[PDB]
Design an enzyme around this catalytic site. Structure first.
Site, PDB file in Angstrom:
ATOM      1  N   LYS A  73      -2.393  76.139  56.208  1.00  0.00           N
ATOM      2  CA  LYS A  73      -2.876  75.515  57.435  1.00  0.00           C
ATOM      3  C   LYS A  73      -2.591  74.028  57.571  1.00  0.00           C
ATOM      4  CE  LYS A  73      -6.893  75.771  58.416  1.00  0.00           C
ATOM      5  NZ  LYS A  73      -7.895  75.445  59.466  1.00  0.00           N
ATOM      6  N   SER A 259      -4.695  69.668  57.414  1.00  0.00           N
ATOM      7  CA  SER A 259      -5.527  69.700  58.613  1.00  0.00           C
ATOM      8  C   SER A 259      -6.868  69.055  58.228  1.00  0.00           C
ATOM      9  CB  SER A 259      -5.707  71.068  59.238  1.00  0.00           C
ATOM     10  OG  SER A 259      -4.703  71.510  60.141  1.00  0.00           O
TER      11      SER A 259
END
Ligand SMILES: *[C@@H]1O[C@H](CO)[C@@H](O)[C@H](O)[C@H]1NC(C)=O
Ligand SMILES: O=C([O-])C(=O)[O-]
Ligand SMILES: [Cu+2]
Ligand SMILES: [Cu+2]
Length: 691
Positions: A73, A259
């Site tokens: 991610k 992230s």
């Protein structure tokens, strides 16, 4: 001690080398510092970053995709810019190069020899394989598309392919030994320049690269003339006709960071300084976008012209585009599964109550409608851009946002006319009439008028919807000219504001005192019914709603506890003139006419969405064949879940199939002005993705 820098992940030696030089010159200029980590490939860089042992790496859109997936991610933080200084761009073209001499078009490549930049690469693999899908005769999973491609072309060079299993695919690679077909420089026919060399050496008949390679690798102009592009309309054009002869326009490579605890600042500061100092022709000490006579594209694309920072709302899928993102997902899907997904309509439900009704509609759609959910409208609009959701009905304030994002109005909620008919059989072509925005007060506050409303407590549907906020604040803004929307009223309930502002002061969250000031039906003071309740319970002194709200909620028209004894006669409307009229005269006592709520979608789903919605309401609409027997789409009874309880039907747009044509100039003109006072993360994201 350790370091203090941004650790760049090199995926090769010649890359660790330059990374090192980059490190030197950062120091030797007293700039922000880069330390270097080493790996043999992009995935290793992906994992190092996710385990905190590198901070960043620049990847091809194919690996942006990969990197976004859990468990990684990673997020794109800075995009490479190509073109020029004054014709800069954050996208490139996927083209198909050939030599002049033959006459075979894009539909006649079966059994030809091809040169690809690398397995999973934008221009080298995802785009061309997706474009030829219709000729591969691929049966779908579980046989990899690879096997279908290996059978389609005679021999090819496709770095990174499994030579064991897809020998044909490594066929043309020039590497010697275990290097034949590597996803690295060892393999000479690797990346754009290797793929081009493959074609140039006469090894393959087509090269799948970017529009720039031929001009980067072929000095002489006439040298360039030996080549041409394979256009998608099965025509051949010159290498300079790329804008009119490309397989796709795709996002540029990007630097991705975590992230979570990402170091985006750092990465952006480092990149910014570096491109000032060492950027495009400006420091023979070091060149961030140039590579040793050995090399090609080390760390960053050779000849990129700089970085463009990515708005914090962008994730891989928004970075990639509905189009490209979906195209990558489809490569791992049967064509029946792909055709089923396009026939189906995925609804975006905002909060749990709306998801509930959606489920209910879903089970009764005969598989034509399925559900999706987010906790805000902006999250739902972000799911439709990603192609993960397809439609939702929105307030005209949202129609503008969706619209600046590329979504179009498809059908509008049609409410009881200025009376044309009765249970109107042409509610579908009957042009929309708009709704009236009104300010409601307690009859007993005889003293309260438009000009004495300022400084009192207010109740709003939500921030950014027409009746509850663009209208009242717009009107106010236009007098004072102040962007401090939190001093217009002393205390409010405006769902979607800072839970800590004065604007959230009167909100009550759910039944338990949670979800305070959230912009979904979780907050009790949310939407039209909730802005009204706020007033009817002496939380606020004014409620910005639509006229119909009071009718629908007083006089036993609603018998929820709180509504039960309200009588229409206890409320009045504030007119602009300073007067006060009863609710029944809103037609001559309103702030303004609001555009009808409209259902929006991506352009690629318009027609099928129309089909589906006309059929479903025929069955579950107002005087719908299954309503109330079985289901009423347009009834949640005073909660307006998915649609307004007063929608007679969904009507055609009569050519206003643009948010601007639909909303109208005064209207766009006005949200624009208000928007300067502050833009949202979501308009910032699309501002970027539009360019
Ligand atoms: C695709 O199918 C058609 C026959 O229906 C055939 O002409 C073609 O050769 C097939 N595919 C390959 C091997 O690319
Ligand atoms: O218009 C509005 O205020 C809404 O739709 O909430
Ligand atoms: Cu690329
Ligand atoms: Cu509205």
């Amino acid at each position: 001690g350790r370091r203090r820098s941004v650790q760049w992940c090199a995926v090769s030696n010649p890359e660790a080398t330059k990374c090192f030089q980059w490190q030197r010159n950062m120091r030797k200029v007293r700039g922000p510092p880069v330390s270097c980590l080493k790996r043999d490939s992009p995935i290793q860089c992906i994992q190092a970053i996710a385990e905190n042992r590198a901070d960043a790496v620049t990847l091809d859109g194919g690996f942006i995709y990969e990197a976004g997936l859990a468990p990684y991610k990673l997020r794109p933080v800075a995009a490479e810019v190509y073109g020029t200084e004054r014709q800069p761009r954050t996208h490139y073209y996927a083209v198909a190069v050939v030599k002049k001499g033959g006459s075979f078009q894009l539909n006649e490549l079966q059994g030809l020899k091809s040169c690809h930049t690398g397995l999973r690469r934008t221009a080298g693999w995802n785009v061309p394989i997706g474009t030829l899908r219709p000729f591969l005769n691929w049966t779908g999973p579980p046989e990899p598309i690879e096997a279908a491609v290996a059978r389609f072309f005679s021999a090819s060079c496709v770095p990174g392919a499994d030579k064991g299993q897809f020998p044909n695919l490594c066929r043309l690679c020039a590497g010697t030994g275990e290097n034949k077909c590597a996803f690295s420089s060892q393999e000479p026919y690797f990346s754009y320049s290797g793929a081009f060399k493959c074609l140039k050496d006469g090894a393959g008949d087509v090269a799948f690269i970017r529009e720039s390679t031929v001009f980067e690798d072929l000095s002489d102009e006439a040298e360039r003339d030996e080549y041409e592009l394979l256009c998608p309309d099965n025509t051949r054009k010159p290498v300079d006709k790329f804008k009119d002869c490309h397989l796709a326009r795709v996002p540029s490579h990007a630097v991705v960071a975590r992230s979570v605890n990402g170091k985006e600042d750092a990465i952006w500061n480092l990149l910014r300084q570096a491109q000032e100092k060492f950027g495009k022709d400006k420091s023979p000490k070091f060149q961030l976008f140039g590579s040793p006579s050995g090399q090609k594209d080390l760390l960053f694309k050779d000849s990129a012209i700089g970085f463009s920072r990515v708005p914090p709302r962008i994730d891989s899928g928004l970075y990639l585009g509905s189009g490209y993102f979906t195209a990558i997902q489809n490569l791992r899907k049967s064509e029946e599964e792909v055709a089923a997904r396009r026939a189906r309509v995925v609804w975006c439900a905002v909060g749990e109550q709306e998801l509930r009704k959606c489920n209910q509609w879903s089970g009764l759609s005969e598989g034509s409608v399925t559900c999706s959910s987010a906790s805000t409208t902006e999250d739902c609009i972000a799911l439709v851009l990603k192609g993960e959701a397809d439609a939702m009905s929105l307030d005209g304030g949202y129609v503008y946002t969706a619209g600046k994002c590329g979504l179009v109005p498809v059908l509008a909620e049609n409410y009881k006319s200025q009376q044309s008919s009765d249970p109107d059989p042409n509610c579908v072509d009957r042009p929309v009439e708009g709704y009236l925005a009104v300010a409601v007060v307690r009859r007993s506050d005889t003293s309260l008028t438009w000009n004495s409303v300022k400084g009192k407590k207010s109740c709003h549907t939500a921030v950014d919807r027409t009746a509850g906020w663009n209208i009242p604040m717009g009107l106010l803004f236009n007098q004072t000219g102040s962007c401090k929307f939190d001093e217009y009223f002393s205390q409010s309930c405006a769902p979607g504001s800072d839970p800590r502002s004065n604007l959230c002061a009167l909100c009550i969250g759910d039944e338990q005192g949670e979800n305070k000031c959230v912009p979904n039906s979780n907050e009790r003071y949310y939407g039209y019914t909730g802005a009204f309740r706020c007033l009817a319970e002496n939380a606020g002194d004014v409620a910005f709603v639509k006229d119909v709200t009071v009718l629908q909620n007083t006089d036993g028209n609603n018998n929820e506890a709180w509504a039960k004894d309200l009588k229409l006669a206890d409320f009045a409307l504030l007119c602009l003139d300073g007067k006060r009229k009863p609710v029944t005269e809103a037609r001559s006592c309103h702030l303004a006419m609001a555009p009808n709520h409209a259902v929006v979608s991506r352009m690629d789903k318009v027609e099928r969405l129309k089909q589906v919605l006309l059929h479903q309401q025929a069955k579950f609409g107002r005087n719908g064949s299954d309503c109330p027997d079985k289901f009423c789409l347009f009834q949640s009874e005073t909660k307006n879940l998915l649609f307004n309880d007063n929608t007679e039907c969904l009507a055609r747009l009569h050519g206003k199939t643009t948010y601007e044509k639909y909303l109208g100039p005064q209207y766009v003109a006005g949200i624009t002005n208000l928007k300067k006072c502050s833009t949202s993360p979501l308009l910032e994201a699309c501002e970027f993705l539009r360019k």
